[PDB]
């Protein structure tokens, strides 16, 4: 299991916006977190939240299976990192 | 944890080859597996093995932390899916 931590300083999201190729508006909410990848300290990672989801609260989390998909070359890829409470 | 299974029919690898941009030869070993992504059946996924590693034997496996890296846009990505026995 991947250990992900939202620190107290990471409790908010920011929003970026724009317009798609054929005219539709979009908004993307982004939040930061720390992920332990086995180095001396955890590393900073950007999360893009799904539509209508609040920011994750501070605490410990692991990664949900729905984060992954098979990509166009047949290998596993991350679609969007989706989290669940540890 | 991600459940990965190497079936008896997937016990071998194949090798692709070529030449890099500035003249160096390369060889890549590829093996197939099944990964349970929570749909009605597991899906077929291609693995690229690391240099000097044999094919994984049939059995059950989970994913090692070294499979992941932070990508050039700051989000988590899979580098190469690396496996360990379950």
Swiss-Prot record, chains A, B:
Stretches of the chain forming a coiled coil according to its record: none
Complexes and interactors: Homodimer.
Family of the protein in this entry: Belongs to the inovirus G5P protein family.
BP-aspect Gene Ontology terms: DNA replication; rolling circle single-stranded viral DNA replication
Site (Involved in DNA binding, and in the dimer-dimer interactions of the protein-ssDNA complex): 41
Keywords: DNA replication, DNA-binding
Signal peptide annotation: none
A GO molecular-function annotation: single-stranded DNA binding
Known function: Binds to DNA in a highly cooperative manner without pronounced sequence specificity. During synthesis of the single-stranded (progeny) viral DNA, prevents the conversion into the double-stranded replicative form. G5P is displaced by the capsid protein G8P during phage assembly on the inner bacterial membrane.
Protein name listed in UniProt: DNA-Binding protein G5P
Species classification: Viruses, Monodnaviria, Loebvirae, Hofneiviricota, Faserviricetes
Site feature (Involved in DNA binding) residues: 16, 21, 26, 34, 46
Gene this protein is translated from: V
The UniProt record lists the keyword NADP: no
């Amino acid at each position: 299991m991947i250990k992900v931590e939202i620190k107290p300083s990471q409790a908010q999201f920011t929003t970026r916006s724009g317009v798609s190729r054929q005219g539709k508006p979009y908004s993307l909410n982004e939040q930061l977190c720390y992920i332990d990848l086995g180095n001396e300290y955890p590393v900073l990672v950007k999360l893009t939240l799904d539509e209508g989801q609040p920011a994750y609260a501070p605490g410990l989390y692991t990664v949900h299976l729905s984060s992954f998909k098979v990509g166009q070359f047949g290998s596993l890829m991350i679609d969007r990192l989706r989290l669940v409470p540890a």
